[PDB]
Write a protein that binds this ligand. Structure first.
Ligand SMILES: NC(=O)c1cc([N+](=O)[O-])ccc1NCc1cnccn1
Length: 294
């Protein structure tokens, strides 16, 4: 607002416009998000305010929540680049495996923390993962979807991606669990490895069928209860599961094994962030410094 001098528009998120701004008094540089209408659910403000206590090194810190004139501003710690941008910039040679592994490991520590505190992200995607020059990666917008809701776009005609959405969400399950975040992270993990989105659906049904075409159409054997879900249709085509080795080549067996557990259809069989941290894939994990051009 007036306490903050806008440095520039960082973009227009799935909620509202985001600016890079400097606190005229503290000199701190932050990310200011103008939340989209006419009242601001008091329930929403309490939820959001709880998130200010959710502090972890791999979680973008929510510094302040400012409610004024039906407008809600969220002040976040600022990071210079997101993983989507970094992946595009690394498309020619790919992100080195030690760095992919470091990033996956840090993201899982972040999820483990939020999940132990009963906070869900629900909308993880590369653009929501921020990185810095120190080799750190952080989860942005944790808990906002719950304090608010699931968008059809953003706030003003903007196609929200479904590429990282768990199948239980696509099948209409009303109660999501921490498992939805593990699914999204597995999709991101695969994308870092192959340099191409795993399931780039362009509609809810195309998203679902792209998943089915790769992991096989789910049935009662692999996913007890699936045929009774809200949007499940007996008319869904029946595709056979594809060999995992064809999915994320040339990822090694440790990596393929972890990814397979992160992409289990049954949310109850899907690996937790905590258990994933103990997976043999992280046996030689390290913290490399990325080459970022800011
Ligand atoms: N907290 C942030 O720093 C940040 C916030 C949003 N957002 O709320 O939509 C988007 C990108 C961000 N950083 C990455 C970034 C910042 N400036 C230029 C390029 N990338």
């Amino acid at each position: 607002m007036e306490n903050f001098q806008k440095v520039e528009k960082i973009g227009e998120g799935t909620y509202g416009v985001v600016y890079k701004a400097r606190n005229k008094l503290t000199g701190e540089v932050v990310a200011l998000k103008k939340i989209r209408t006419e009242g601001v659910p008091s329930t929403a403000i309490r939820e959001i305010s709880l998130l200010k206590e959710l502090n972890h090194p791999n979680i973008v810190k929510l510094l302040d929540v400012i409610h004024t004139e039906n407008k809600l501003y969220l002040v976040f710690e600022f990071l210079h680049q997101d993983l989507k941008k970094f992946m595009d910039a690394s498309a020619l040679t790919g992100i080195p495996l030690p760095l992919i592994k470091s990033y996956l490991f840090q993201l899982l520590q972040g999820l483990a923390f939020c999940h132990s505190h009963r906070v869900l992200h629900r909308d993880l995607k590369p653009q929501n993962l921020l990185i810095n020059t120190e080799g750190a990666i952080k989860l942005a917008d944790f808990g906002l979807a719950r304090a608010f809701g699931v968008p059809v776009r953003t706030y003003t005609h903007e196609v929200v991606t479904l590429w990282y959405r768990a199948p239980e969400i696509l099948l209409g399950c009303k109660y999501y669990s921490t498992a939805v975040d593990i699914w999204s992270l597995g999709c991101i993990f695969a994308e870092m490895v192959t340099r191409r989105a795993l399931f780039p659906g362009d509609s809810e049904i195309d998203q679902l069928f792209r998943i089915f075409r790769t992991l096989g159409t789910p049935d009662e054997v692999v996913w007890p209860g699936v045929t009774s879900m809200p949007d499940y249709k007996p008319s869904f085509p029946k595709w056979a599961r594809q060999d995992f080795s064809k999915v994320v080549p040339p990822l090694d067996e440790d990596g393929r094994s972890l990814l397979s557990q992160m992409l289990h259809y049954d949310p109850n069989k899907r690996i937790s962030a905590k258990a994933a941290l103990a997976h043999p894939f992280f046996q030689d994990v390290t913290k490399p410094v990325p080459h970022l051009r800011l």
